[PDB]
């Protein structure tokens with residue numbers, strides 16, 4: 001009778017329309033392109049010096065954007081296999097971290113890597129600590145799905161867990177931004193008028209812009225059928241596809257361009 | 271008919287009484303307090319020198335006690351949401367590492383971090399190796415729950431897995447204590463009568479005391495309905511709450527006090 | 541009606557014969573022996589210098605073969621407990637990473653460690669990156685099991701996921717071998733005729749031989765009931781036991797012998 005968390009739910013027909021299926025295809029294609037591009041950048045990178053063969057091979061923190069895009073691509077491969085077979089893939093079948101049959105179970109793998117990577121660009125403190133908190137926020141979102149989709153007697157568990165996640169998200173942000181802020185401040189005074197100043201401006205704004213676009217995820221939760229229900233389940237899939245293209249692919253391309261142009265300029269100051 | 275491992279089990283009414291629910295509330299409050307306290311110590315720590323701003327931010331091994339308390343707090347948040355909704359949370363619903371709807375599934379995340387942290391205080395060898403073995407012991411305990419709570423035809427699987435876990439636990443201990451012993455021995459001769467001797471005495475006894483209190487977990491298993499059944503399921507929840515307050519919170523406060531008083535005294539010798 | 545992914549499947553009688561049960565016993569005994577042997581080598585190792593007490597304790601990358609054998613031993617302990625109780629253990633019960641009730645769910649823990657260890661022997665670049673890709677390939681194999689064993693309407697999902705895994709496996713190999721190749725090339729010119737040359741020859745061939753034996757896993761998939769069905773489920777269990785003895789135990793013994801004889805000879809060049 002309740003399908004969430006079961007194999008019975010997995011064998012049902014897909015509830016998704018052409019709009020949601022099209023969004024999954026679009027997201028998979030963009031993530032696959034980004035993965036091959038970031039793979040090429042990883043192979044050919046010689047570092048800021050431009051004299052170290054397989055630089056990204058020895059400094060493997062450089063491959064974090066590649067692995068974010070690669071794991072997101074694997075998750076969307078699963079969504080398009082399920083869509084083309086025409087079976088239900090929403091919060092049914094086996095619970096596997098890094099796989100997106102459970103909403104936010106894919107992000108539990110990729111988001112901690114993405115926050116680590118963002119903070120690593122500014123050599124910011126609390127990188128592992130912010131990855132751990134993001135892991136717990138995404139766990140909160142997974143548990144809110146089980147309550148939201150289960151027996152309506154337990155529905156208020158979804159708000160308890162959303163609230164917990166939002167609490168720690170606001171906390172994490174209000175500490176993260178106060179690190180990104182101090183890291184730019186340190187380097188800004190250090191940079192003086194050297195020309196590294198302009199690249200350092202760009203790095204702070206890019207890292208801040210991509211950080212702040214993460215607020216779209218709890219906002220989509222609030223407007224979708226989990227909260228107010230102003231958008232349906234099909235448009236929620238479209239909202240997540242767009243947010244994933246921005247958070248992972250556009251981030252991946254933006255960072256890859258920064259490393260192409262401004263890496264050495266800041267490698268002396270960072 | 272058998273509920274362990276199923277969503278059907280999750281929708282049943284809670285089997286817990288007021289004593290077990292009160293123990294969960296008490297444990298959640300203490301873990302939340304410890305988390306905020308250890309968060310404050312992490313933010314304000316300047317290291318043993320007292321001259322490094324955001325020391326714990328760059329030396330993130332210092333945040334391990336914080337993350338143990340934070341993940342235990344998340345697990346107990348889940349128990350009190352389930353208690354207040356009034357649904358069954360004992361070995362039912364989705365299997366998620368770091369979440370305590372399966373007994374020992376929460377500990378699979380926090381215990382390896384806690385053993386790493388203990389051995390890191392003495393700069394002991396085999397820190398990752400001891401974290402790996404503790405992970406396997408807690409896996410053993412998870413698998414013993416599935417056999418203990420399932421079809422009684424398979425009940426003897428619970429003893430096979432408890433035995434496996436106990437075997438490797440005795441092994442791990444009988445090697446760990448022989449490291450803690452040699453690490454104190456090395457530093458004891460090195461310390462001479464310098465005043466660092468007294469702090470080093472305290473560190474060995476504290477690390478040994480907290481290590482030895484981990485024997486309470488397999489002893490609670492033996493006395494609870496899994497073994498002899500001298501205590502019921504409600505008193506087992508109380509026993510785990512008390513053991514968690516000692517193993518995580520009291521450990522967290524004890525370590526934080528050691529770092530406040532004796533960090534620099536031993537940072538020259540460690 | 542479909543048992544894959546369910547607790548109902550776990551309570552069924554074993555489908556395995558004496559040949560498959562004997563293979564599980566044989567594999568468990570060999571992995572346990574290898575674990576105790578590699579444990580002894582870890583304890584007594586003094587490094588290439590032969591002057592560092594608990595060398596493997598401080599350089600914990602040396603314990604990777606030990607932890608591969610230890611986790612494989614835990615997985616086979618589970619198979620023999622299930623065989624002796626006489627219950628079904630094939631892709632039923634709880635999904636737990638590092639546990640082999642789901643085919644390839646045990647390997648998701650051990651294979652990334654094993655590829656890290658192989659590449660670490662040659663100080664090869666892309667070690668974490670190759671561990672991440674192997675993790676995704678083994679995830680692909682897990683998802684192909686759910687489709688292969690479920691509702692036959694969704695059977696073609698098994699080929700989609702096998703294809704995805706094979707694609708990234710060929711990719712990973714065709715990049716890995718081009719690293720092992722360049723790492724041997726670098727050291728070969730560096731070694732000249734010093735006597736380190738002969739040991740370096742042995743290391744390249746051993747690492748290449750063990751790397752290439754990993755092709756047996758997707759080949760067994762193709763010949764077993766997942767693909768052409770030339771062998772039955774019982775002989776598939778035997779094929780995996782033999783492949784595990786070679787990939788983990790024989791690897792473990794071969795590496796341990798290399799470190800006994802040729803460690804110092806190459807520690808100056810590596």
Ligand SMILES: CC(C)CCC[C@@H](C)[C@H]1CC[C@H]2[C@@H]3CC=C4C[C@@H](O)CC[C@]4(C)[C@H]3CC[C@]12C
Nearest residue numbers: 028029030031032033034035036037039040041
């Ligand atoms: C989406 C499916 C069909 C996979 C196709 C991936 C395509 C788009 C990938 C694979 C190889 C890639 C190319 C690899 C190398 C280079 C050289 C350099 O100048 C950067 C871009 C460029 C030219 C890449 C563009 C994207 C690319 C063409």
Ligand SMILES: CC(C)CCC[C@@H](C)[C@H]1CC[C@H]2[C@@H]3CC=C4C[C@@H](O)CC[C@]4(C)[C@H]3CC[C@]12C
Nearest residue numbers: 028029032077080081084085696697699700703
């Ligand atoms: C990047 C673009 C160009 C290529 C698309 C790649 C993937 C997503 C495509 C290519 C071929 C596809 C498969 C083609 C055939 C079948 C059989 C059908 O009964 C179920 C769907 C299934 C199993 C498809 C799933 C999706 C699939 C694996």
Ligand SMILES: CC(C)CCC[C@@H](C)[C@H]1CC[C@H]2[C@@H]3CC=C4C[C@@H](O)CC[C@]4(C)[C@H]3CC[C@]12C
Nearest residue numbers: 298299300301302303304305306307309310311
């Ligand atoms: C349990 C629920 C209600 C959450 C409440 C957490 C409370 C207990 C936390 C939040 C902020 C914390 C304080 C933060 C900072 C300091 C300064 C220093 O002198 C150590 C203790 C002290 C004074 C902390 C004591 C505990 C504290 C008051």
Ligand SMILES: CC(C)CCC[C@@H](C)[C@H]1CC[C@H]2[C@@H]3CC=C4C[C@@H](O)CC[C@]4(C)[C@H]3CC[C@]12C
Nearest residue numbers: 156157159160163298299302347350351354355
């Ligand atoms: C630390 C102390 C002071 C604060 C306690 C925090 C948490 C555990 C409390 C505060 C408010 C609580 C919620 C209040 C309202 C409801 C609706 C009810 O139908 C189910 C329980 C549920 C969902 C509660 C779960 C537990 C809860 C989230």
Ligand SMILES: CC(C)CCC[C@@H](C)[C@H]1CC[C@H]2[C@@H]3CC=C4C[C@@H](O)CC[C@]4(C)[C@H]3CC[C@]12C
Nearest residue numbers: 568569570571572573574575576577579580581
């Ligand atoms: C498979 C079950 C019964 C467990 C038994 C494990 C046995 C085979 C293990 C445990 C202790 C091990 C021994 C430990 C130490 C040494 C000394 C050295 O010269 C290497 C081999 C040798 C002699 C080992 C051989 C294997 C050994 C005997």
Ligand SMILES: CC(C)CCC[C@@H](C)[C@H]1CC[C@H]2[C@@H]3CC=C4C[C@@H](O)CC[C@]4(C)[C@H]3CC[C@]12C
Nearest residue numbers: 426427429430433568569572617620621624625
């Ligand atoms: C290495 C060799 C020498 C020792 C073998 C170790 C393990 C695999 C053996 C030793 C004793 C065995 C147990 C003996 C008794 C029972 C009770 C029976 O109703 C179910 C099987 C079960 C639970 C067995 C499972 C496997 C077991 C745990």
Ligand SMILES: *C/C=C(C)/C=C/C=C(C)/C=C/C1=C(C)CCCC1(C)C
Nearest residue numbers: 138141162165166169214217218247
């Ligand atoms: C690649 C995907 C990214 C970067 C996703 C990030 C998602 C979040 C920050 C989600 C956060 C949420 C909360 C703050 C509350 C609980 C619900 C979530 C999971 C949507």
Ligand SMILES: *C/C=C(C)/C=C/C=C(C)/C=C/C1=C(C)CCCC1(C)C
Nearest residue numbers: 408411432435436439484487488517
């Ligand atoms: C914060 C919680 C802690 C430190 C818990 C530690 C738990 C253990 C060491 C449990 C060990 C067990 C065995 C030795 C055998 C199997 C049963 C267990 C899991 C209770």
Ligand SMILES: *C/C=C(C)/C=C/C=C(C)/C=C/C1=C(C)CCCC1(C)C
Nearest residue numbers: 678681702705706709754757758787
């Ligand atoms: C100890 C076990 C080892 C080293 C196992 C390795 C297994 C693989 C490389 C398996 C690979 C597969 C694919 C290439 C495609 C999908 C099916 C798999 C999982 C068999």
Ligand SMILES: CCCCCCCCCCCCCCCC(=O)O
Nearest residue numbers: 156159160161163164165167302347
């Ligand atoms: C340390 C944790 C801090 C507290 C964070 C969680 C607090 C928010 C709980 C929200 C519960 C909302 C329940 C709504 C009930 C209703 O619909 O009437």
Ligand SMILES: CCCCCCCCCCCCCCCC(=O)O
Nearest residue numbers: 166169170215218219222226227228
């Ligand atoms: C932390 C980022 C910002 C998140 C903004 C949260 C705004 C509150 C959303 C609550 C939605 C759940 C309650 C809706 C219930 C209903 O009216 O049906």
Ligand SMILES: CCCCCCCCCCCCCCCC(=O)O
Nearest residue numbers: 426429430431433434435437572617
């Ligand atoms: C390397 C592994 C070492 C062995 C560790 C496990 C051995 C203990 C097995 C205990 C089985 C107890 C079964 C009791 C059967 C009964 O009740 O009659």
Ligand SMILES: CCCCCCCCCCCCCCCC(=O)O
Nearest residue numbers: 436439440485488489492496497498
């Ligand atoms: C390794 C730490 C010490 C653990 C102490 C173990 C003591 C044996 C407990 C076995 C309990 C299981 C058998 C009870 C069966 C019964 O009598 O009903």
Ligand SMILES: CCCCCCCCCCCCCCCC(=O)O
Nearest residue numbers: 032077696699700701703704705707
């Ligand atoms: C980036 C991903 C690359 C593509 C890798 C997967 C492509 C192989 C898909 C195989 C599908 C085979 C379906 C067979 C259908 C049938 O039986 O008729």
Ligand SMILES: CCCCCCCCCCCCCCCC(=O)O
Nearest residue numbers: 706709710755758759762766767768
């Ligand atoms: C990447 C390593 C090599 C793998 C070799 C793959 C060979 C193709 C195997 C496809 C098997 C699945 C299709 C069989 C369908 C059938 O005929 O019943």
